[PDB]
Amino acid sequence: AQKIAVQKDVDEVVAAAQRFLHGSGDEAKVDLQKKASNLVQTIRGPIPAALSSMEDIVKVASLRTLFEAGVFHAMPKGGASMTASEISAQTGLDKGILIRLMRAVTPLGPFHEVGEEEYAHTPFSEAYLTADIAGCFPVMSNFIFGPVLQICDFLRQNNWKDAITTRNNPFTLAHNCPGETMFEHLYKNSKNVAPVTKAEAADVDQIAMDLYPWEERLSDAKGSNATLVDIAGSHGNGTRAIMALAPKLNGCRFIVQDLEPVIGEHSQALRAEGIEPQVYDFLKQEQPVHGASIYYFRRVFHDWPDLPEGKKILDNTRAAMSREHSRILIHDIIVPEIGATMSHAWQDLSLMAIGGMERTEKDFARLLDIAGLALVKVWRKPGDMMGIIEARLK
Amino acid sequence: AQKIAVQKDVDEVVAAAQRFLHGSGDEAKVDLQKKASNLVQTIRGPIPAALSSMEDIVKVASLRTLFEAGVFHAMPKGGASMTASEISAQTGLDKGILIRLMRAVTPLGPFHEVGEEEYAHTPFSEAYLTADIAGCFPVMSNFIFGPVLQICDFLRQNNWKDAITTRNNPFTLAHNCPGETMFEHLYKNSKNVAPVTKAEAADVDQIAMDLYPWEERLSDAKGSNATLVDIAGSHGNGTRAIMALAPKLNGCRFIVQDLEPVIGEHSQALRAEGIEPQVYDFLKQEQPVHGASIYYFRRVFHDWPDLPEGKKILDNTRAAMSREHSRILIHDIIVPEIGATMSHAWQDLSLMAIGGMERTEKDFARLLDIAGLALVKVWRKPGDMMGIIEARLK
Numbered sequence: 119a120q121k122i123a124v125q126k127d128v129d130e131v132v133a134a135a136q137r138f139l140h141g142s143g144d145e146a147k148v149d150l151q152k153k154a155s156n157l158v159q160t161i162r163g164p165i166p167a168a169l170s171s172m173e174d175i176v177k178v179a180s181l182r183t184l185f186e187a188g189v190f191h192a193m194p195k196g197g198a199s200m201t202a203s204e205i206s207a208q209t210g211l212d213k214g215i216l217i218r219l220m221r222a223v224t225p226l227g228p229f230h231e232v233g234e235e236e237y238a239h240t241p242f243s244e245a246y247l248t249a250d251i252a253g254c255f256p257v258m259s260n261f262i263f264g265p266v267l268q269i270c271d272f273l274r275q276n277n278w279k280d281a282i283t284t285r286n287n288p289f290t291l292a293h294n295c296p297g298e299t300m301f302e303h304l305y306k307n308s309k310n311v312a313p314v315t316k317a318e319a320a321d322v323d324q325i326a327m328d329l330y331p332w333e334e335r336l337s338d339a340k341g342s343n344a345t346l347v348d349i350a351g352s353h354g355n356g357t358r359a360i361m362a363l364a365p366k367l368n369g370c371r372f373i374v375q376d377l378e379p380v381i382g383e384h385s386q387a388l389r390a391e392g393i394e395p396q397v398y399d400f401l402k403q404e405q406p407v408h409g410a411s412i413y414y415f416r417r418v419f420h421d422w423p424d425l426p427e428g429k430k431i432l433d434n435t436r437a438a439m440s441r442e443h444s445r446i447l448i449h450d451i452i453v454p455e456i457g458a459t460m461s462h463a464w465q466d467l468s469l470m471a472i473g474g475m476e477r478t479e480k481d482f483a484r485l486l487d488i489a490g491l492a493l494v495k496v497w498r499k500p501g502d503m504m505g506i507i508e509a510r511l512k
Numbered sequence: 513a514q515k516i517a518v519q520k521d522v523d524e525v526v527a528a529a530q531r532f533l534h535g536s537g538d539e540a541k542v543d544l545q546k547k548a549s550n551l552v553q554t555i556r557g558p559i560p561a562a563l564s565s566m567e568d569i570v571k572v573a574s575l576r577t578l579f580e581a582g583v584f585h586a587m588p589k590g591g592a593s594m595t596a597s598e599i600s601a602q603t604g605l606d607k608g609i610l611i612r613l614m615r616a617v618t619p620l621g622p623f624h625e626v627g628e629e630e631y632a633h634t635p636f637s638e639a640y641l642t643a644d645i646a647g648c649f650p651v652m653s654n655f656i657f658g659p660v661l662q663i664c665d666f667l668r669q670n671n672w673k674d675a676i677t678t679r680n681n682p683f684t685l686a687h688n689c690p691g692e693t694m695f696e697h698l699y700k701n702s703k704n705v706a707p708v709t710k711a712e713a714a715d716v717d718q719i720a721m722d723l724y725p726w727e728e729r730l731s732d733a734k735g736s737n738a739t740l741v742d743i744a745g746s747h748g749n750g751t752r753a754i755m756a757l758a759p760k761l762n763g764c765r766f767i768v769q770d771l772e773p774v775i776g777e778h779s780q781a782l783r784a785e786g787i788e789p790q791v792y793d794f795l796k797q798e799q800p801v802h803g804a805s806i807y808y809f810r811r812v813f814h815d816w817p818d819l820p821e822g823k824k825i826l827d828n829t830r831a832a833m834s835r836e837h838s839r840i841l842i843h844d845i846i847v848p849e850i851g852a853t854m855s856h857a858w859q860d861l862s863l864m865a866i867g868g869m870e871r872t873e874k875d876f877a878r879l880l881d882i883a884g885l886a887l888v889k890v891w892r893k894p895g896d897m898m899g900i901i902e903a904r905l906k
């Protein structure tokens with residue numbers, strides 16, 4: 119047979135493993151994870167591997183059900199087992215459904231099938247209980263997955279032309295709410311604000327904030343100029359990072375603006391840590407606080423297309439700047455023009471469903487020129503997916 | 513670090529590989545594919561691996577869009593490349609959308625990113641163009657995936673109780689058609705009949721038909737008794753298999769019954785190969801042809817719950833039998849009670865969305881007793897997922 123295929127792929131895994139296990143602080147790790155995948159695919163063969171999409175779908179379905187139904191929380195941590203019966207008992211999910219669902223997440227899924235109707239946690243299932251995953255994953259599976267699946271349906275309505283807008287997209291199609299942006303439609307139900315703000319807090323790859331010199335720029339600023347605004351700062355974790363990074367400071371104003379339901383959830387937590395909670399909308403208003411150090415956008419612009427909303431953000435902010443004292447900092451993923459990762463692809467293509475997108479370097483170039491903005495410098499410590507786009511008035 | 517984790521998992525892959533590469537005609541292969549997956553998961557780590565559900569989702573989305581938009585067919589086979597521009601040109605899918613979508617299916621996806629806006633087929637993407645995958649995959653992604661994703665939503669409506677029925681399920685919820693069974697709602701639009709009949713024809717794991725002695729049983733039958741009926745035979749590929757298996761025959765009637773839109777698509781193809789195309793409905797009618805060799809159900813019962821429809825099938829067929837001359841053959845997956853595969857899980861849990869299910873041996877036991885039917889013998893050549901349930905009147 120073509121068992122030969124397996125050998126070559128095993129060899130490469132073995133090879134790539136050896137490399138990974140004697141480098142330092144990267145390409146090695148990614149390459150090995152890639153050669154590891156090739157093996158699985160090669161073992162299965164092209165035709166059986168095409169069935170992976172169906173397998174993948176039920177697994178995401180069943181994981182989502184199980185997590186919502188309280189199964190992850192009812193099951194004992196540390197790998198102690200529990201029965202179908204005892205689980206169903208504590209959650210009220212149909213023991214027959216639960217048994218069937220479990221089959222999707224034991225054979226390889228993050229659970230362990232100890233024995234007949236007997237299941238256990240592993241660290242991979244327990245990872246779904248951590249702040250990052252537990253804040254992120256439910257929101258995505260309740261509100262985003264179904265839309266991403268309907269991308270095909272939306273573009274088919276336009277004979278594969280790009281009709282996507284912020285208010286007419288696979289999200290509005292799937293949740294039947296044409297005209298509303300994703301945020302608008304979620305915040306209308308107030309029960310959603312807390313989960314969504316937690317999801318907005320999720321930072322799985324640990325964003326690097328020592329990427330650009332805060333201490334230097336902010337404390338070379340005299341008086342009213344010395345003040346940073348985290349626009350759409352949400353929680354404010356970005357601000358707190360910055361503040362931690364430079365305490366080499368005087369009395370410096372630190373403001374976190376965002377919509378009202380967001381400002382509610384985090385306000386007095388922010389007053390506490392010493393930050394001004396300001397309610398602001400960069401779509402219906404011009405930027406209030408004038409002539410500041412820098413106006414800082416973190417994981418904001420990828421929510422938006424270049425026009426209309428993209429230009430209006432930067433235009434409503436040009437209003438309150440200073441030709442040479444203020445500066446603008448966009449902090450977001452910079453997609454390579456070749457060799458994108460699945461980390462790149464899943465964030466970008468999810469946004470696609472709500473009319474957002476992740477931007478190339480040349481994509482950020484277009485955005486700046488459109489708003490008559492001059493690129494000062496792009497900060498990136500490569501081996502790191504996010505850079506900062508620094509810019510000024512032309 | 514815990515680079516140790518990678519080593520142990522590499523070792524096991526290497527080990528399981530060596531075993532697989534000196535067995536014969538199985539557990540070896542599955543175990544290696546399992547240890548291969550562990551490695552990928554271990555390399556990524558529990559928290560980053562939880563993000564695999566999001567990655568998996570966009571990949572299925574983007575594959576579905578690309579295949580529908582005609583990209584798989586526009587691209588040259590054999591690994592010759594083609595540009596974003598030349599592809600968009602031949603399909604009219606937005607070159608900007610196409611570029612973004614491609615990122616989900618190059619890094620590991622079945623395509624190869626030759627260079628900037630330059631992509632190529634590999635045998636893994638070309639596999640999507642084969643009869644099995646190309647008949648199966650579109651139907652699933654258009655009609656089934658979205659429902660499977662909404663399993664959680666449906667059961668949440670019932671506080672995780674099992675409300676699922678053949679006409680009230682995640683399918684009726686997602687496609688908004690409460691009251692219709694999956695088949696009813698698809699056949700209402702006649703453009704769907706041809707794709708769905710091709711999907712029904714899909715047989716990816718190559719079902720074993722030499723599993724039970726046709727030559728022996730059929731040709732020990734005198735006269736009007738000697739006649740087999742493939743109920744819901746669709747295409748009739750099952751019948752043709754059987755006929756090929758025994759030509760050691762006299763003039764033996766071979767009938768393939770199914771609903772009308774199915775009988776249309778395949779009728780004169782079946783008359784041709786010498787088979788009686790009969791229109792029949794085992795929900796609204798009793799079984800016409802009386803006292804036959806055997807009544808044969810292939811990949812039928814997993815479309816149905818035990819009651820109502822399950823019992824009514826066997827009851828409408830008991831009508832036309834012979835206490836000791838006729839026999840009933842259910843041919844379907846037999847789920848193990850432990851160590852289910854993802855192959856088991858994806859078929860069962862998809863059905864779950866339309867109120868169907870795959871059955872245990874003890875599950876088939878319940879079904880038989882409920883219809884007052886006696887188990888003669890279960891045929892299985894293990895290492896093979898499907899058996900036959902042979903049964904008679906009690």
Ligand SMILES: C=CC(C)(C)[C@@]12C=C(O)C(=O)N3/C(=C/c4c[nH]cn4)C(=O)N[C@]31N(OC)c1ccccc12
Nearest residue numbers: 254257262317318320321322323417421465468469
């Ligand atoms: C789900 C709601 C939001 C959290 C608001 C989110 C919006 C953001 O602006 C954002 O930063 N996000 C995430 C960051 C992250 C990075 N590592 C772990 N989490 C994230 O998962 N989901 C989102 N995201 O991004 C891919 C979305 C995609 C489609 C709709 C909405 C969003």
Ligand SMILES: C=CC(C)(C)[C@@]12C=C(O)C(=O)N3/C(=C/c4c[nH]cn4)C(=O)N[C@]31N(OC)c1ccccc12
Nearest residue numbers: 648651656711712714715716717811815859862863
């Ligand atoms: C999609 C429509 C059907 C083909 C009618 C199908 C019904 C069957 O009875 C069947 O046998 N099927 C398949 C067999 C197969 C085995 N290996 C490759 N294909 C299959 O994919 N899809 C289905 N299937 O089963 C998991 C479904 C699941 C949910 C709804 C409908 C179905």
Ligand SMILES: Nc1ncnc2c1ncn2[C@@H]1O[C@H](C[C@@H](N)CC[C@H](N)C(=O)O)[C@@H](O)[C@H]1O
Nearest residue numbers: 301318350351352376377380399400401416417
């Ligand atoms: N019209 C709007 N005006 C101002 N902020 C908005 C608007 N729409 C959405 N947002 C906020 O943009 C933020 C997007 C967040 N994902 C980013 C928050 C934060 N900068 C972070 O990096 O995590 C949310 O907090 C939104 O509430």
Ligand SMILES: Nc1ncnc2c1ncn2[C@@H]1O[C@H](C[C@@H](N)CC[C@H](N)C(=O)O)[C@@H](O)[C@H]1O
Nearest residue numbers: 695712744745746770771774793794795810811
């Ligand atoms: N009420 C019904 N009565 C008779 N056949 C039905 C009914 N509903 C669905 N079917 C058929 O059941 C079959 C299910 C197929 N997946 C199986 C066909 C074939 N036995 C095979 O193994 O591939 C389809 O051909 C349906 O048209």
